[PDB]
Amino acid sequence: LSLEGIGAVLQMTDDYTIIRSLVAGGPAALSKQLGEGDRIIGVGQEGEDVVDVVGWRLDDVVQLIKGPKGSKVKLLVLPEGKDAKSHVVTIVRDKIRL
Ligand SMILES: [Cl-]
Ligand SMILES: [Cl-]
User: Fold this and answer.
1) Which ligand sits nearest to residue 53's alpha carbon?
2) What CA–CA distance (Å, rounded) separates 60 from 75?
3) Ligand 2 mean position, distance from CA 45 (Å)
4) How far apart, in whole angstroms, are the C-alpha atoms of residue 82 and residue 64?
5) 87 C-alpha to ligand 1 centroid (Å)
6) CA angle 11, 17, 18 (to 5 degrees)
7) CA 65, 15, 47, 86 torsion-angle sign
8) Which residues does residue 17 pair with via DSSP β-bridges, in sequence order?
9) Nearest ligand to the C-alpha of residue 58?
């Protein structure tokens, strides 16, 4: 089994896409910039705007995150917490064995 993307396990709770876990050895795990509880509120492709994904269906969000090996994805991350502010994390996608 393989996947071309970042190696993040996502779950949807109350309109938010949230990191549940990271796939062992994947780009997300290797980055050290993502963790359980982080909310992904926007996704941008290279050179493009960061599209708001709050309230979307999870499969539609995943389709923006996955992509070709070597291409970059911008994730607008909102850490866990009532008054959290957001920041961007850039991950280089890879083909990962699950
Ligand atoms: Cl895939
Ligand atoms: Cl959903």
Assistant:
1) 2
2) 15
3) 22
4) 26
5) 26
6) 65
7) negative
8) 12, 40
9) 2
